[PDB]
């Protein structure tokens, strides 16, 4: 019942890394006017889940685009503008992404320390 | 030959642990090679087949990467630590069994 | 680990856009000149999962 | 004297093991171990 | 003399083991171990 600790900690590490990647992507594309197809960029974020086969590690279910309405600015001399001359811009909270990165990094560090301690105890168990 | 088989179970377990460790080290070393595919083996089924010439499987990617590199870091690092711990556990079990067999002849 | 590459690419493209704006500002008196617009395009990569 | 058992029409298998893998880039695999039994004639 | 037991219509299986995996990219697998029994005639 002590080898599941590695699985739980690895799942936590992977979930935190995915959240950090999503935050970095949002920060990078904070000011993306359009994507490949033409639709305006929309902020994305992960949805965690409990990875219980009873409790266990954390698990990322999927990635969803934020339901908050995208911003829109006035620019008639742009082919992307609609009939009213409004071009859509993504709705990204820069402070939100920053604090998400901070929390993800701290949780990453905590999980690393947990894994290190458990590895040390497992290593010392064999000296019975 | 009875001794051969009785120690052979653990000896083959240790050998497969060593092979898996080598593959994990290889995909750690090549972690930044573009166009690389993460490789791994299924320990339980491989051991069953050997007890009753090693095939390897492609690890399922978790995130996309433009340079074509699919070998993650965190998952394989946890795998490396787990494999090292289980290799040490197998080593000490085999050593205990051998010492128990030996001390009877004293 | 690869999350560093998207951020560095964003920084490099920001530097390029700054270069474009500086080039626009440099020739602020050349007769019959047309300014250069600039914009950032998102280029998602479609892998296997997530 | 030994009668030929090369043709699969009248071989005499005592054992066998036929593994077949296949993935799809149509990678394939086919292992096959066979243990035979053979006729024999001996004159002195 | 040994009677042929290649054709599956009148083989004489003593054991068997038939594993079949299949995933869907229609990856497949089919292992099969077989132990046979064979007729025998001996004249002197």
């Amino acid at each position: 019942a002590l080898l599941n600790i590695f699985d739980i900690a690895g799942s936590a590490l992977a979930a935190q890394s995915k959240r950090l990647n999503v935050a970095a992507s949002n920060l990078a594309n904070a000011d993306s006017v359009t994507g490949p197809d033409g639709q305006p960029y929309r902020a994305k974020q992960v949805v965690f889940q409990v990875d219980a086969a009873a409790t266990g590690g954390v698990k990322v279910a999927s990635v969803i685009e934020s339901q908050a309405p995208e911003k829109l600015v006035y620019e008639p001399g742009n082919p992307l503008a609609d009939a009213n001359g409004y071009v859509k811009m993504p709705n990204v909270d820069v402070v939100g992404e920053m604090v998400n990165t901070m929390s993800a990094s701290r949780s990453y560090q905590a999980n690393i320390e947990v894994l290190n301690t458990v590895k040390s105890m497992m290593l010392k168990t064999l000296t019975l | 030959d009875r001794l051969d088989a009785a120690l052979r179970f653990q000896q083959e377990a240790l050998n497969l642990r060593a092979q898996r460790q080598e593959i994990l080290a290889a995909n750690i070393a090549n972690a930044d090679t573009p166009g690389y595919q993460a490789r791994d083996i299924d320990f339980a089924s491989e051991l069953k087949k050997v007890m009753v010439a090693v095939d390897l499987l492609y690890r399922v990617p978790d995130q996309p990467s433009l340079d074509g590199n699919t070998v993650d870091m965190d998952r394989e690092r946890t795998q490396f630590a787990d494999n090292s711990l289980k290799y040490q556990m197998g080593l000490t079990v085999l050593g205990s069994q051998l010492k128990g067999m030996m001390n009877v002849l004293q | 680990d690869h999350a560093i590459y998207t951020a560095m690419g964003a920084a490099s493209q920001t530097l390029n856009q700054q270069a474009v704006t500086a080039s626009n500002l440099a020739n602020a008196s050349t007769p019959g000149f047309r300014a250069q617009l600039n914009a950032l395009r998102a280029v998602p990569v479609d892998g296997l999962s997530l | 004297h030994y009668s030929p058992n090369g043709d699969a029409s009248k071989a005499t298998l005592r054992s066998r093991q036929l593994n077949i893998s296949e993935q799809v880039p149509r990678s394939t695999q086919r292992n096959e171990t066979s243990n035979y039994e053979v006729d024999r004639t001996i004159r002195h | 003399h040994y009677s042929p037991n290649g054709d599956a219509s009148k083989a004489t299986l003593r054991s068997r083991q038939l594993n079949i995996s299949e995933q869907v990219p229609r990856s497949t697998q089919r292992n099969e171990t077989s132990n046979y029994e064979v007729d025998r005639t001996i004249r002197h």
Partner: peptide
């Protein structure tokens, strides 16, 4: 399947098209 698991055939190539044809 789930990320981090094992599978028989490799992942498809990853591409980043600047503009969809």
């Amino acid at each position: 399947g789930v990320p981090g698991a094992l599978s028989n055939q490799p992942a498809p190539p990853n591409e980043a098209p600047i503009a969809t044809p």
